Each structure stands twice: as structure tokens, then as C-alpha cells.
Structure 1
Amino acid sequence: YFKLKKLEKEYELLTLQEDYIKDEQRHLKRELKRAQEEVKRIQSVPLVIGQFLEPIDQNTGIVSSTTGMSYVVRILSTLDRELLKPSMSVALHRHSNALVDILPPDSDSSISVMGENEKPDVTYA
């Protein structure tokens, strides 16, 4: 008679797991909502300048800020190995100190000024 009892005990798993599928979908919508909120806190308004040195782990790296003190920031999920430059001047966060974007090596400064022309108006030939 144990055959009938062992079956009814298995429907207790089938009872909750039917509505638990949609609970993960509604939770996924909340996770995607929080995912968009975490990206805003990485950059938002405040931004600073820093120089990348060496990484450690995924979303972890050691950089050098403008003040001279090194800080451990959170490497962007897009930058891994090839996309991540070994030594480059990048952007960081004021307080939270998170990686922002790779800044181009601008040669324009107050010393060793080299002029650059944009869209000359002289007609060829």
C-alpha cells in the first residue's frame, strides 16, 4: 500500500514549484532593476582622474589617482584582458573609487604644446 503514499508525497514538490517559476521571473525583474541602479552609482555625476597599474581579480584592480595615493577600484566587467590596457590613464570615482572609462592619452597641456588642425579649409590642388 506504500505505492499510493509515496506518490502523494511527491506532489508537494510539484505544488510549490509551479508558482515558484514565475517568482524567479518577478525576482529577475527586480534584479534587472537593481542592475541598472548599480551602474548609475559607478559613474553618475562625480568623476576623477586615475592611472591604471595592475589588476588582481575580476572587477578588482590597483590604480593610481591624481593625488598620488593608490586605491583598489572595481574594474569594469567589459574590460578583462585584451580590452584592458596594461598602463593607461583612465577615469575613476571621487569617493566610491570605481573604474569608469579609458581616457585617451591627450598630448595637449601647458608644456610641450603641439598644435593640431581640425578640418582645414584649403582646397586641394
Structure 2
Amino acid sequence: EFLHAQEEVKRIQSIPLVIGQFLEAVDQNTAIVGSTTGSNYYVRILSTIDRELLKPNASVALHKHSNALV
């Protein structure tokens, strides 16, 4: 089951994502991102992302529909 869950977690970060700019984070599991669409969104971040890669000018890919930053 855990392997299946990780397979899905890989699946959620597949190709069609949209690019955005990572503003300052909020909590362990959420952050603020500025989308290339122009608007900004309050977005929960996937745990698998290494937080140390996250910087207030980092280029970050958002979920196409849910805007979830993975």
C-alpha cells in the first residue's frame, strides 16, 4: 500500500504542471506562490520537496488545476 501511495505521489507531479514563483513559505506543509498566470495563491506544498531548495525567488511548478505546488 505504501508503495502504491508513493507511485500516486509521483503521478501527481507528472508533466502538465504550470510554472510559478515561490514567495515566502507559511507552515511546514503550505506556502505562498506567484503563478505565471499573474495571480498569487495560498498553496499547500508536497512533503517530498526538499524545503532547503525553496527560496523566495525559486521557480516552482504548480498543479495545473489545484495549483498545488509540487
Which TM-score band applies after superposition, normalised by the shorter structure? 0.7 to 0.9
- Superposed, which structure 2 residues align to 1:35-114 within 5 Å? 35-41=6-12, 43-77=13-47, 78-80=49-51, 82-100=52-70
- Asked whether the 8 Å contact 2:30–2:43 carries over to 1, the reply is yes
Number of the residue aligned with 1:4:
none
Question: Partner of 2:53: helix, strand, or coil?
Answer: coil
Q: Structure 1 unaligned segments of length 5 or more: list them.
A: 1-29, 101-125
* Greater fraction of residues in helix: 1
Task: Tell me the percent identity.
Answer: 65
- Asked whether the 8 Å contact 2:22–2:34 carries over to 1, the reply is yes
**Structure 1 residue 32 displacement after superposition:** 2.4
Q: Structure 2 unaligned segments of length 5 or more: list them.
A: none
User: Which segments of structure 1 move beyond 3 Å, counting only runs of 4 or more?
Assistant: none
**Structure 1 residue 34 displacement after superposition:** 1.6
Number of the residue aligned with 1:31:
2
Return the index of the structure with the highest Cα Rg: 1
| Number of aligned residue pairs | 69
* Greater fraction of residues in strand: 2
**Structure 1 residue 99 displacement after superposition:** 2.0
**Which fold has the larger relative contact order, with Cα–Cα distance below 8 Å and residues 6 or more apart in sequence?**
2
**Structure 1 residue 60 displacement after superposition:** 0.9
**Structure 1 residue 50 displacement after superposition:** 0.5
**Structure 1 residue 94 displacement after superposition:** 0.9
TM-score after normalising by structure 2: 0.74
